[PDB]
């Protein structure tokens, strides 16, 4: 623990060797014990400033960040006869109540007076849980709970032929067609596209499937009533059939234009009167119909920080899918500039999720290959939530100003979500807009009201609470550094399409600065609370990142795809990202945590983001989330290479490697152990490649070693050093 | 024999005119009643005629450029020949430099006059079928459907292209063995395309139109599985059929692929046109077709605009040179009043009937592809007429199955006759019983030389040629030997079809009626103001009578018809022969009884007698009356005793003959068996019989002897 | 407004 | 001539099951609502109701109702084939589960046979009263 101060220009290796834990806000013991849990819902300042004005004097941006559909281990369920809330302001009876006349309940969020429905009240489940999941009533719906409804929109133009994604894609639905969240009512359907929509209809009573082919672009329709959108259980065999069949249907295609607008259009249409999942596959830039984007000229390390979408269409699109209940998750394998700086908007908007993959080939790019295989894994086995929203509550005095996520905002805080994801992340802003001279506590409450892919209607509930302060100093005790940064990427992700890619950069370093620089005027070298010692180290970091970078030859389809992640992910995926951890793998031993029955698995210390800490006499593994890069010394250790990567010599280490293997060496249990617990920690399995060869031309696990300088970017000793010079100016 | 020659000429030359001698001045041909016509058939069979794989050989004169006939002036020694159209001279060409008097040109002999050449230079191109579906119909009728349009292809040449077209609510234009999956371009019938848009919109074969050879298989199994148009179709309401759209997207997928060459867009409706562009009726079950009645009372909202749409489409079809047959079965009308000018104009095919699941239907649509003594098709496709006349004829136009290719020149009348205006014109469609009226005028021997180019089903090109020459009225007798070259019946015929042709395209009775006068006081013979005196030569006799029939058939009193029965009726009339004509005017009727052998007897009611059976062969009709007398002996069960082994001989007399012809005519004529008091009796007696003839006779005499 | 169910 | 069906208890108007299809059923849909809640064991185990340009027909048995919502025109008798068969099925399966449940639409996957029933009649090939009064 500690209230030290710290002087950033001494230490220069303040970042701790085990994982960051998450601040624990200064709470009695028993009301802790209870509060939510962090990697659900967290806020940027665990004190909350009892006013505004100390909330600015700070600098610090008070906002919160939650991941609820989050996959939970033991989920309480609720069945009530009827859900107890408060008459005023609508809050989910929770942990956090004050229970008084003991058959009434004071509401922690408006202060309302409640009675207790004859329905020890304060041992109800309700009470002795943050997370929690409620059953919803028939009020608490606007229609029969809708099925599950998943259409498919493949792109099968030449391109697209080329890079041959379409036929994984098809092999996965087929491995997982069992595993599709649903009940007996799941419906499925398919569509393709070049220059022309192409519908399928799949009869029981006809041998073949049957491609309907739409042509007037300028006005698409449905072309029959029934089958288009088939009843899975019923029809397996068929749609097992049409998986076998699609990826060959179009090898010698000539058709080089695509109208992905109308098909979207036309997908939309068939899914209207349901609501559903549209997972839409695309790989080039939008030449036909409307929604046609023109090309673009991808810049280079030389043009300086002078984005935003070049139509509105697929924004007005996705308001549309979303008034139905209707979701679009974009999946681009271009090879070439796309616009994805407003292709995305067709899944910002519909609470969709984009996925990416640069020059995606079956041949040429092994590893995007398995990227897919395995993200497409996780897409399509995860649970999901159909026709749900969320509001947030927050105590009086308290408001949420602004929303960071893929939804729509209908009236304040009725966030939209044609679909929910359980990878899905969101962070909000508030502000103080009553003195919190009242309380001493106050809490915040998100419901996730929708229908489960079973046909169920259900809430689910997180609750929060959290101590009022009135000083600086305070404020800054609880700081979670973590959060505040992620916070701000969003702001600054929305800084740069709202302004420049600039003035996104400059208030990313003006939010460290005009902070430790309050600080300051509030207490030589660069002195900042314990809290705030990682606050430099991760905003550079994130003026490094392919969001914000500027220096570099990042192409546009890129950077776009940057800060739509920063958008929709979790904080905790957004750290991984920004700062990757490395570990030195070509030693480890026993101080693992060996608890883990049977296996051991090494805790290797966690590395700065520097090349001063690599070594030419061995291997460096860097997790950053979505893959891990084993990068190998060319001076390694005979033994590394014979047992642990089964060469005999650094030359003859495989140029992609895709995976390491498994042979019975005490070194390969080690790390094959250690990185399969670190894949444990997540939903999402991570590629690992090794390629990271010190001559693979595929060393972008340099790029990560955000500590250095850079023909074009300072250095932590060079940020340190700017940020003190106008700490004191 | 006067008629002898008729008889030999039809058989030879296939044409009639209405005079075999014309007037060889103008004080003549001006006053002439009935015009001078012909009823030309172009393709009509006969005692296997030598083909004629030469180069025809023509006149060198750039205008005239006539065919060489029997009729040219020749001189063998002079190798050279001199046209008897224009007199110029020509000099043989180098393949003739070997004729001789002993062995002279086929095409010279008057045995060969009328004959077929055929001219091999350019690789022959296939013949195109596209099938055009309608899928809103009964299940039972919808099968039926398939199996036929299933053995069609079974029939087509192997070189054949093909093509399908099924719709409903939608239209779908089928992509042939696409291979393990099966497509369709889908298109709203809501509106129409032009062709550049279906050729922009869709992208020797196409993946549309493939060699039968080739595609066979995957199109027959395609039939096979075809199902009714998905849509439901809610209570009271019809189907929503899209029949215009999907003609007009056949239409111009054609138009865009192969223009200007043999093609059959065979469209088969079993229900009317729901869903405009040509939109018929609306789906409001509550609301009737639109009747004749209906139409006089302007209570017909779609009629104009519908008729519209698919007139300006055969013009299309028939511009591109493709033909268009409409193959209708509902119970109730299907709106072949507005669609008759496709079948019209191009040489397409109409077979009406009540539904595809019938006898009638399946055998008439098989019928479509009767094939000749080599294995081939009776049809004929883009052929081109053109009629070359001696200086002194000028044409008028024609009546029939046909299009004016709008060509000028000095044959050409000021007076212009049905399709008129042209010396030439184009038949997208034709089989040997393809019959056009050509009104001819003058302004011995005068000759019309008749040159019908066209694409055979063997895909040879060929230009069938017939000159015929008549003899130039002598001055000294005029109206006595033009009277007695007069072909009643030929001129009943022209004559009805100038009427109808004026109706359809609208009092007619009144100009029939004056005309019959005139005709009964130019060649009659009475003395004025004595009807008893009034008598016809035994070459005008009948015209009378055959006038009294055509003023009183359903080809001119359409009410008590449905304007779709209407249409079918005249397009068959427009079309047929001389002979097959007549019956349709004048049904033949037949007596079968113990007193003789069968007798044909008069149409009047005292023909129909209680112990004999009736055999009314109206074109479209064959009928068998059994009288009440027979009828109870029949009732009465005596056939099946051994004892009345001639009762049998008796009851299917008439139902052997009616068999025989019940198969050689194209639209398989109805049957009938009915007897005094049968609901169906009323055929016979609506036939039968202002009033009767006998008082037709009465007041047209009362007028031929009165003013002039 | 399913949440707040005012 | 078209649609909307809804299968609920009749005690607390229980949802149990319901089909729909759009491409309004807003307003259509709290009028099925209300009648629900208002049945009960006095009402008429037989009805059709006049809403304007449509028509509710419901039957009630075994304190289990089916309604059904279509156009005016829509043959009456067979709005009530319709039901009839819905019944016999759905008292067949989970008739005897009905008394006992909780949870809204407790027999969704009865969204099924709803559908592949309501279609055999909406292809052509008692008592009365104004909703708006009962209400
Ligand atoms: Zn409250
Ligand atoms: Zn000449």
Redesign the pocket.
Same mark, same amino acid.
């Given at each position: 623990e500690g209230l030290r101060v710290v002087n950033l220009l001494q230490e220069r290796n303040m970042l701790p060797s085990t994982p960051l834990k998450p601040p624990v806000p200064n709470l009695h013991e028993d009301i802790q014990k209870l509060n939510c849990n962090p990697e659900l819902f967290r806020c940027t300042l665990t004190s909350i400033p009892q006013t505004q004005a100390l909330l600015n004097k700070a600098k610090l941006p008070l906002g919160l960040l939650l991941h609820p559909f989050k996959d939970l281990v033991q989920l309480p369920v609720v069945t009530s006869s009827t859900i107890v809330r *408060?008459?005023? *302001?609508?809050?989910y009876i929770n942990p956090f109540v004050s229970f008084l006349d003991q058959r009434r309940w004071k *509401?922690?969020? *408006?202060?309302?007076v409640?009675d207790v429905p004859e329905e020890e009240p304060h041992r109800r489940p309700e009470v002795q849980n943050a997370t929690i999941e409620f059953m919803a009533p028939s009020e608490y719906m606007l229609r029969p709970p809708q099925p599950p409804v998943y259409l498919f929109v493949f792109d099968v133009s030449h391109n697209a032929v080329e890079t041959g994604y379409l036929n994984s894609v098809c092999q996965s639905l087929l491995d997982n067609l069992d595993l599709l969240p649903g009940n007996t009512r799941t419906k499925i359907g398919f569509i393709t596209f070049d220059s022309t929509i192409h519908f399928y209809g799949l009869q029981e009573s006809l041998s073949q499937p049957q491609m309907l082919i739409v042509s007037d672009i300028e006005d698409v329709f449905i072309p029959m009533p029934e089958n288009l959108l088939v009843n899975l259980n019923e029809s397996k065999e068929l749609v097992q059939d049409l998986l076998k069949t699609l990826p060959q249907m179009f090898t010698k295609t000539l058709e080089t234009q695509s109208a992905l607008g109308p098909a979207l259009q036309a997908a939309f249409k068939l899914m209207s009167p349901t609501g559903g999942r549209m997972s839409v596959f695309q790989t080039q830039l939008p030449t036909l119909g409307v929604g046609a984007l023109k090309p673009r000229e991808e810049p280079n390390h030389r043009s300086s920080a002078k984005m935003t979408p070049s139509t509105d269409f697929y924004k007005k699109l996705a308001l549309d899918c979303s008034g139905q209940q209707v979701a679009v998750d974009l999946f681009l394998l271009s090879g070439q500039y796309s616009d994805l700086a407003s292709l995305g908007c067709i899944s910002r908007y519909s609470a969709g999720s984009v996925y990416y993959y640069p020059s995606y080939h079956h041949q040429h790019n092994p590893v995007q290959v398995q990227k897919l295989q395995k993200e497409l894994q996780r897409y399509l086995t995860r649970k999901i939530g159909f026709e749900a929203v969320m509001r947030i509550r927050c105590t009086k005095g308290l408001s949420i100003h602004t929303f960071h996520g893929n939804f729509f905002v209908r009236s304040t805080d009725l966030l939209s979500l044609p679909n929910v994801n359980p990878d899905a992340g969101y962070a909000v802003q508030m502000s103080v807009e009553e003195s919190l001279t009242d309380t001493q506590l106050v809490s915040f409450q998100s419901a996730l009201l929708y229908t489960s892919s079973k046909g169920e209607r259900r809430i689910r509930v997180h609750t929060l609470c959290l101590p009022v302060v009135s000083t600086l100093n305070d404020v800054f005790l609880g700081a979670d550094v973590q959060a505040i940064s992620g916070l701000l990427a969003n702001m600054a992700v929305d800084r740069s399409m709202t302004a420049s890619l600039s003035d996104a950069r400059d208030a990313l370093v003006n939010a460290v600065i005009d902070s430790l620089s309050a600080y300051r005027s509030s207490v030589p070298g660069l002195m900042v609370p314990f809290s705030l010692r990682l606050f430099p180290l991760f905003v550079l970091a994130l003026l490094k990142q392919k969001s914000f970078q500027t220096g570099t030859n990042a192409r546009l389809d890129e950077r776009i795809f940057a800060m739509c992640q920063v958008k929709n992910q979790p904080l905790v995926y957004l750290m991984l990202t920004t700062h990757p951890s490395l570990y030195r793998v070509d030693n480890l031993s026993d101080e693992g945590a060996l608890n883990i029955s049977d296996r051991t698995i090494p805790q290797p210390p966690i590395l700065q983001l520097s090349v001063e800490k690599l070594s030419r006499d061995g291997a460096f593994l860097m997790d950053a989330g979505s893959v891990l890069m084993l990068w190998v010394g060319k001076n390694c250790t005979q033994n590394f290479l014979s047992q642990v990567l089964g060469v005999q010599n650094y030359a003859s280490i495989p140029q992609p490697m895709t995976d390491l293997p498994e042979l019975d060496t005490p070194e390969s249990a080690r790390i094959i152990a250690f990185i399969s617990w670190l894949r444990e920690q997540r939903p999402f399995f991570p590629i690992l490649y090794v390629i990271a060869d010190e001559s693979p031309m595929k060393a972008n696990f340099l790029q990560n070693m955000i500590e250095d300088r850079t023909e074009s970017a300072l250095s932590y000793y060079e940020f340190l050093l700017h940020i003190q010079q106008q700490v004191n100016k | 024999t006067y008629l002898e020659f008729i008889q030999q000429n039809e058989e030879r030359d296939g044409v009639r005119f209405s005079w075999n001698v014309w007037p060889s001045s103008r004080l003549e041909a001006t006053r002439m009643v009935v015009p001078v016509a012909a009823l030309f058939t172009p393709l009509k069979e006969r005692p296997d005629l030598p083909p004629i794989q030469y180069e025809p050989v023509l006149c060198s004169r750039t205008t005239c450029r006539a065919v060489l006939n029997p009729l040219c002036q020749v001189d063998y020694r002079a190798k050279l020949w001199a046209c008897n159209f224009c007199y110029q001279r020509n000099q043989f060409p180098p393949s003739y430099a070997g004729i001789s008097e002993l062995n002279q040109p086929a095409e010279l002999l008057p045995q060969f006059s009328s004959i077929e050449y055929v001219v091999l230079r350019g690789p022959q191109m296939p013949l195109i079928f596209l099938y055009v579906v309608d899928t809103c119909m009964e299940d039972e009728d919808l099968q039926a459907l398939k199996e036929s349009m299933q053995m069609s292809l079974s029939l087509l040449p192997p070189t054949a292209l093909v093509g399908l077209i099924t719709f409903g609510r939608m239209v779908q234009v089928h992509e042939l063995g696409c291979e393990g999956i099966s497509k369709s371009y889908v298109f709203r019938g809501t509106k129409d395309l032009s062709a550049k848009q279906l050729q922009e919109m869709l992208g020797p074969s196409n993946r549309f139109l493939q060699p039968v050879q080739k595609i066979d298989m995957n199109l027959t199994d395609l039939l096979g599985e075809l199902q009714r148009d998905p849509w439901p179709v809610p209570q009271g309401k019809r189907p929503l059929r899209s029949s215009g759209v999907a003609l007009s997207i056949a239409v111009g997928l054609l138009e865009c692929t192969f223009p200007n060459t043999g093609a059959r867009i065979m469209m088969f409706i079993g229900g009317p046109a729901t869903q405009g562009p040509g939109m018929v009726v609306g789906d409001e079950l509550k609301t009737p077709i639109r009747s004749w009645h209906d139409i006089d009372k302007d209570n017909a909202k779609y009629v104009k605009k519908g008729t519209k749409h698919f007139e300006a489409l055969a013009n299309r079809a028939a511009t591109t040179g493709h033909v268009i047959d409409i193959y209708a079965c509902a119970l109730d009308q299907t709106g072949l009043l507005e669609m008759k000018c496709c079948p019209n104009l191009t040489g397409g095919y109409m077979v009406m009937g009540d539904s595809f699941n019938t006898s009638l239907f399946k055998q008439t649509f098989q019928r479509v592809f009767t094939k000749d003594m080599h294995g081939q098709f009776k049809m004929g496709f883009g052929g081109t007429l053109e009629i070359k006349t001696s200086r002194e004829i000028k044409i008028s136009g024609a009546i029939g199955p046909c299009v004016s290719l709008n060509s000028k020149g000095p044959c050409v009348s000021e007076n212009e006759i049905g399709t008129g205006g042209t010396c030439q014109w184009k038949i997208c469609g034709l089989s040997p019983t393809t019959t056009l009226a050509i009104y001819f005028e003058v302004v011995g021997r005068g000759a019309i030389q008749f040159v019908t180019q066209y694409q055979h089903s063997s895909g040879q090109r060929r230009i069938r040629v017939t000159t015929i020459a008549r003899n130039w009225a002598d001055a000294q007798t005029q109206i006595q030997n033009i009277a007695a070259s007069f072909d009643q019946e030929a001129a009943a015929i022209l004559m009805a079809r100038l009427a109808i042709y004026r109706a359809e395209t609208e009092d007619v009775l009144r100009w029939l009626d004056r005309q019959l006068i005139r005709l009964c006081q130019k060649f009659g013979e009475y003395h004025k103001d004595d009807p008893s005196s009034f008598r016809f030569s035994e070459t005008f006799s009948l015209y009378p009578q055959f006038m009294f029939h055509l003023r009183r058939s359903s080809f001119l009193q359409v009410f008590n018809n449905s304007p779709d029965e209407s249409s079918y009726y005249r397009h068959h009339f427009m079309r047929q022969d001389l002979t097959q004509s007549l019956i349709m005017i004048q049904p033949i009727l037949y007596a079968y009884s113990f007193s003789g052998p069968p007798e044909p007897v008069l149409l009047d009611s005292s023909s129909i007698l209680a112990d004999r059976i009736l055999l009314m062969d109206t074109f479209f009709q064959i009928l068998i009356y059994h009288g009440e007398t027979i009828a109870q002996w029949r009732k009465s069960g005596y056939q099946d005793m051994p004892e009345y082994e001639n009762f049998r001989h008796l009851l299917q007399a008439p139902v052997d003959d009616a068999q025989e012809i019940l198969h050689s005519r194209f639209p398989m004529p109805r049957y009938i068996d009915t007897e005094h008091g049968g609901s169906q009796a009323r055929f016979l007696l609506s036939k039968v019989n202002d009033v009767s003839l006998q008082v037709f006779m009465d007041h047209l005499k009362k007028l031929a002897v009165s003013s002039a | 407004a399913c949440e707040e169910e005012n | 001539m078209v649609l909307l069906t809804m299968i609920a208890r009749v005690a607390d108007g229980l949802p149990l099951a319901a089909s729909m299809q759009e491409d309004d059923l807003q307003q259509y849909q709290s009028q099925a609502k209300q009648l629900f809640r208002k049945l009960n064991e006095q009402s008429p185990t037989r009805c059709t109701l006049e809403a304007g340009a449509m028509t509710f027909h419901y039957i009630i048995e075994q304190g289990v109702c089916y309604l059904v919502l279509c156009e005016a025109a829509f043959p009456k008798k067979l709005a009530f084939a319709y039901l009839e068969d819905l019944h016999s099925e759905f008292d067949e399966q989970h008739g005897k589960k009905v008394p006992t449940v909780s949870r809204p639409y407790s027999f969704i996957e009865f969204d099924t046979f709803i559908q592949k029933t309501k279609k055999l009649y909406i292809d052509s090939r008692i008592m009365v009263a104004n909703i708006e009064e009962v209400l």
């Open positions: *408060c008459r005023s *302001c609508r809050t *509401c922690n969020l *408006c202060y309302r409640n | - | - | -």
